[PDB]
């Protein structure tokens, strides 16, 4: 009389311990493999007053290639994987499977654009903890990579027609979420630290900062972005500034596949049937969610 059933499971990519674990790991890797020559951070006392802490340490310049990694299940635990089409990242999952480790990941610290991540299987998918809340970041997962090549020459190359198509398809998806009649518009960052305002990322150990204005000025050949390599930066790991050594060889290069984006929607009390979206990012945890959203670890019961 007993009946066979698939173990259903509810997921929440926005409250997934794995994302925090990864965050702490990348920070570990950096703290041990990419140390700044000088680090400035606020040193405070419970009262609220702060002073700048200064850390000077050996900062060997290392040319690094991406080391693929993955997260695996410890004894007594299991990693569940949601296999549903267009999975929202939240709620019950119909087709679930189990795995020993997650897929191979080539983590990348960056803003605005997600580089070298996983592509969506079907069409472009967009996810947010709550679309109605404009303060919640929108994670865009592309189904087609747009190659972006940079050179120490001070600029990165991006196919224009390719990116134009991308913006349109993303717009379409946003319309599927907010209304087929609303007008979709992309605008540059409203501002903030350089890291937040530009499309920044670390490639081969160097810190790139690119003007992404061209990238997000759209209405519903090559696109050359003015980029720059910086030695003095604001840290993503914690509040503070860091200084690293200058580039070695010279004529720095980088080739990456734009596989996602982090967007923000302008709070709109203004009734006009139009939605505006700008480049987002900053908290690197959203970068980790883009890769870990379909996994959930559970106790073997």
């Amino acid at each position: 009389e007993v009946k066979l059933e698939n173990v259903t499971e509810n997921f929440n990519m926005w409250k997934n311990n794995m994302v925090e674990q990864m965050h702490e790991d990348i920070i570990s890797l950096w703290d041990q493999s990419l140390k700044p020559c000088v680090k400035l951070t606020p040193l405070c006392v419970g009262a609220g007053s702060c002073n700048t802490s200064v850390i000077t340490q050996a900062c060997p310049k290392v040319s690094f290639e991406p080391i693929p990694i993955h997260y695996c299940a410890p004894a007594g635990f299991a990693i569940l994987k949601c296999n549903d089409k267009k999975f929202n990242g939240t709620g019950p999952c119909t087709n679930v499977s189990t795995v020993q480790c997650t897929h191979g990941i080539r983590p990348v610290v960056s803003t605005q654009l997600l580089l070298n991540g996983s592509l969506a299987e079907e069409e472009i998918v967009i996810r947010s903890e709550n679309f109605t809340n404009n303060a919640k970041t929108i994670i865009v997962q592309l189904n087609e990579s747009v190659v972006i090549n940079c050179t120490g020459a001070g600029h990165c190359n991006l196919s224009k027609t390719q990116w134009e198509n991308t913006l349109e398809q993303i717009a379409i998806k946003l319309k599927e979420q907010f209304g087929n009649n609303k007008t979709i518009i992309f605008n540059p960052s409203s501002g903030g630290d350089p890291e937040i305002v530009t499309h920044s990322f670390n490639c081969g150990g160097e810190f790139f900062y690119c003007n992404s204005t061209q990238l997000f000025t759209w209405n519903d050949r090559n696109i050359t972005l003015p980029c720059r390599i910086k030695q003095i930066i604001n840290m993503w790991q914690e509040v503070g500034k860091a200084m690293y050594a200058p580039p070695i060889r010279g004529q720095i290069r980088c080739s990456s596949n734009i596989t996602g984006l982090l967007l923000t929607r302008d709070g709109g009390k203004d009734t006009n049937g139009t939605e505006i979206f700008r480049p987002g990012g900053g908290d690197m945890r959203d970068n980790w969610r883009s890769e870990l959203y379909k996994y959930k670890v559970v106790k073997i019961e």
């Binding site: 409203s190 501002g191 903030g192 890291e195 937040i196 840290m235 503070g240 900053g282 908290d283």
Partner: peptide, 27 residues
């Protein structure tokens, strides 16, 4: 995050300030 200095700088530009992880963002 340095939220105090973030708000002040963003505000002087007619915008609101807030932390985006450990970075300052102007909304």
């Amino acid at each position: 995050x340095n939220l105090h200095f973030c708000q002040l700088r963003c505000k002087s530009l007619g915008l609101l300030g807030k932390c985006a992880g450990s970075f300052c963002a102007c909304x």
